[PDB]
């Protein structure tokens, strides 16, 4: 394979986020192991699983898990790792809990000890401290990532990689402008990976199928690449997408071709997104009829 990791997000458990706790099968749904198997057979080896902190550990993040939501997270993780692929456990929470900024590193560390304890023996689990920190204090983002690492390792989960995320929605293109302080994170296992996201539409929000230009992806990750190299760090693109059109196709392959010549720092890339409730979503990687599964996956072949 070209990269250490190449795969897809498996979205759904974080859906309908305005309904807390919400109802499984009505507001949210978990990934389908059968279609995960199909993506595994195509050569993908990493699957990132968004979920809501409030659904896994309700009311207070220092409390006990919700049995039913945890049982389905466990089932999803095991469905991925039993085959030999990596499962990224992603509290898809934007640095916020019940829509308030998480300002207690100690509370966050307890949450992460609770979560890591469920997976501590599984070396194919990857812990992702939180999805897309944004519009919050830059020192707090550093300290939350460090508290997560401390909680994870305190649970005896020492074999696993930890994906840390930065401010500005962990964007690659904005990384050096705001996230330099993230270089000081420490891990006794030395398995920190800096997870950045990069979309290709004009404002980088990943909501339009139109890409700025055929080179916009490779352009948007060059300064992040040099930041990783200058600081002796490793990175991954944890979310990326583009529409099913010629300009985006070229932007996607140009970005991945650049990463492929910079694997001293880039460990790989994760598409946004697959999952069973995307329907006609412009970026759906869900077999067998998602638009990206049909029209984008053929151009990802050389990286599988
Ligand atoms: O039996 C069917 C069942 O359906 C229930 O209703 C479903 C409905 O069928 C679905 O269409 C709907 O799906 C929406 C989700 O609720 C919503 O959470 C999801 O949000 C997406 C968003 O569309 C997408 O843009 C977003 O990308 C953000 C990422 O999170 C960022 O990381 C990245 O930067 O890019 C974008 C930036 O915006 O992701 C979120 C998900 O994280 O959109 C779905 C529509 O595409 O779900 C309904 C349930 O909530 C019905 O209620 C039941 O009765 C019925 O049984």
Q: Are 238 and 270 within 8 A, CB to CB? A: yes
| CATH placement of domain 5-303 | 3.20.20.80
How was this structure determined? It was done by X-ray
Atom 9, ligand 1: which residue's CA is nearest? 277
Residues whose CB is less than 8 angstroms from the CB of residue 226 and which lie 6 or more positions away in sequence, other chains included: none
CA of 228 to the centre of ligand 1 (A): 33
Instruction: Measure 254 CA to ligand 1 centroid, in angstroms.
Output: 29
User: What's the Cα-to-Cα distance from 57 to each of 54, 115, 120, 204, rounded to whole Å?
Assistant: 5, 9, 18, 31
Ligand 1 pocket check: which of 9, 16, 51, 130 to mutate, most ligand atoms within 8 Å of Cβ?
A: 16
- For strand 100-101 and strand 96-97, is the pairing parallel, antiparallel, or unpaired? antiparallel
Query: Ligand 1: does its nearest atom lie under 6 Å from the Cβ of 16?
Result: yes
CB of 14 within 6 A of ligand 1: the answer is: yes
- Evaluate: CB of 15 within 6 angstroms of ligand 1: yes
* Ligand 1 pocket mutation, candidates 200, 277, 280, 283, criterion most atoms within 8 A of CB: 277
Domain boundaries, the chain: 5-303
Peptide bond into 21 cis (omega under 30): yes
Separation of 25 CA from ligand 1 center, angstroms?
13
């Amino acid at each position: 394979k070209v990269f250490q990791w190449f795969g897809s997000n498996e979205s759904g458990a974080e859906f309908g986020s305005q309904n807390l706790p919400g109802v499984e099968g009505k507001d949210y749904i978990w990934p389908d192991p059968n279609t995960i198997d199909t993506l595994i057979s195509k050569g993908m080896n990493i699957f990132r699983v968004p979920f809501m902190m409030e659904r896994l550990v309700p009311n207070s993040m220092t409390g006990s898990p919700d049995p039913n939501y945890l049982a389905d997270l466990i089932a999803t993780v095991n469905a991925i790792t039993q085959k030999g692929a990596y499962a990224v456990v992603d509290p898809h929470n934007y640095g916020r809990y019940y829509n308030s900024i998480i300002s207690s590193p100690s509370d966050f560390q307890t949450f992460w000890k609770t979560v890591a304890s469920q997976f501590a023996s599984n070396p194919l689990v990857i812990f992702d401290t939180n999805n897309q920190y944004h519009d919050m204090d830059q020192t707090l983002v550093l300290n939350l990532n460090q508290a997560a690492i401390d909680g994870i390792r305190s649970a005896g989960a020492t074999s696993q990689y930890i994906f840390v995320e930065g401010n500005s929605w962990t964007g690659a293109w904005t990384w050096t402008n705001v996230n330099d302080n993230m270089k000081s994170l420490t891990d006794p296992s030395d398995k920190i990976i800096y997870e950045m996201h990069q979309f290709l539409d004009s404002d980088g929000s990943g909501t339009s199928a139109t890409c700025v230009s055929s080179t916009i992806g490779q352009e948007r990750i060059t300064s992040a690449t040099q930041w990783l190299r200058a600081n002796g760090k490793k990175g991954i693109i944890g979310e990326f997408a583009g529409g099913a059109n010629d300009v985006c196709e070229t932007a996607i392959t140009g970005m991945l071709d650049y990463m492929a010549q910079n694997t001293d720092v880039w460990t790989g890339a994760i598409w946004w997104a697959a999952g069973p409730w995307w329907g006609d979503y412009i970026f759906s990687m869900e077999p067998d009829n998602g638009i990206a599964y049909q029209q984008i996956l053929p151009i990802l072949t050389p990286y599988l």
